[PDB]
Amino acid sequence: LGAKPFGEKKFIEIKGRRMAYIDEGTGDPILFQHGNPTSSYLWRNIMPHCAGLGRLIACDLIGMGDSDKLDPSGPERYAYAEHRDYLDALWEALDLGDRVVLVVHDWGSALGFDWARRHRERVQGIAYMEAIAMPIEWADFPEQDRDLFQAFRSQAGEELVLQDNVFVEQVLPGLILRPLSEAEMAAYREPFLAAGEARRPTLSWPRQIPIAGTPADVVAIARDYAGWLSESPIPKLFINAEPGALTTGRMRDFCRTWPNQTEITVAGAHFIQEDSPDEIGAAIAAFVRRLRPA
Numbered sequence: 082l083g084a085k086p087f088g089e090k091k092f093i094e095i096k097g098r099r100m101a102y103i104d105e106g107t108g109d110p111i112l113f114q115h116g117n118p119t120s121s122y123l124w125r126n127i128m129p130h131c132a133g134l135g136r137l138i139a140c141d142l143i144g145m146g147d148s149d150k151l152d153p154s155g156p157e158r159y160a161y162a163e164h165r166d167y168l169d170a171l172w173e174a175l176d177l178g179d180r181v182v183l184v185v186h187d188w189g190s191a192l193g194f195d196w197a198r199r200h201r202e203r204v205q206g207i208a209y210m211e212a213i214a215m216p217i218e219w220a221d222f223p224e225q226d227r228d229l230f231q232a233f234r235s236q237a238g239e240e241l242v243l244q245d246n247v248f249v250e251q252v253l254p255g256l257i258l259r260p261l262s263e264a265e266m267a268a269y270r271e272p273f274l275a276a277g278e279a280r281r282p283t284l285s286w287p288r289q290i291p292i293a294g295t296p297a298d299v300v301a302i303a304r305d306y307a308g309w310l311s312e313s314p315i316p317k318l319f320i321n322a323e324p325g326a327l328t329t330g331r332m333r334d335f336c337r338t339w340p341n342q343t344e345i346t347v348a349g350a351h352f353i354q355e356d357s358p359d360e361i362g363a364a365i366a367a368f369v370r371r372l373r374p375a
């Protein structure tokens with residue numbers, strides 16, 4: 082597997098803040114976007130498979146990875162809309178061109194799907210896995226994690242996450258089938274070593290998941306890209322997971338109705354990149370080779 086990151090971290094100022102990202106190679110972008118509570122590090126063993134197939138980019142969401150924190154931070158900070166404003170500006174600053182291939186996961190998919198809907202003419206292909214493909218109901222949420230996430234979305238969330246770093250220390254490992262190494266966990270907890278607001282992004286995210294109609298704004302956004310994706314002819318690669326976690330049941334049933342889509346199944350729960358990186362990288366590279374023929 083390997084715990085070493087892919088390439089060197091680069092920095093650029095956005096909205097008066099500093100954001101970190103990986104940008105290696107030349108040509109049309111193959112954009113990898115992580116979710117909660119990860120960073121660009123999540124794709125370290127996947128991006129290599131796309132070597133020479135394009136400009137390999139992986140951005141650290143604001144307040145995450147090596148990107149700046151948003152002070153003053155609080156319950157109102159790090160909502161989906163705010164993350165979008167920063168990511169939109171970062172992607173604009175990167176001069177991506179008009180033949181972008183998106184590779185998304187978790188909140189990176191909500192952000193990526195929305196961006197794609199808004200810049201559809203610039204999207205050459207979309208590879209996704211364990212994504213937030215549509216608004217859901219509690220019955221659709223994984224049973225084993227249902228109570229905990231309901232707790233995150235309650236006044237108990239602050240103690241769980243800001244004080245005890247539960248999303249990083251409990252959820253993350255709990256949704257990876259193979260044992261992580263000391264170095265791998267170190268890389269994941271690094272941005273959240275300090276108790277308090279430094280960990281706010283990992284609490285604000287679960288409170289943004291479009292479940293049972295709340296929050297209304299994210300539900301509407303997801304409803305929008307869900308409808309669009311179900312009709313868009315843009316080529317797609319759906320990397321299904323077994324047993325999987327988020328993209329199972331009804332949501333998986335929905336994703337499987339999407340047009341011009343190739344699907345493969347790999348072993349894993351939610352953070353499948355840590356369980357089947359080679360299968361995932363190989364599939365993405367093949368997908369790209371078909372989208373960018375000699």
Ligand SMILES: [Ca+2]
Pocket residue numbers: 178180
């Ligand atoms: Ca071109």
Ligand SMILES: [Ca+2]
Pocket residue numbers: 254255256257258259260
């Ligand atoms: Ca585990």
Ligand SMILES: [Cl-]
Pocket residue numbers: 117286287288290
């Ligand atoms: Cl979340």
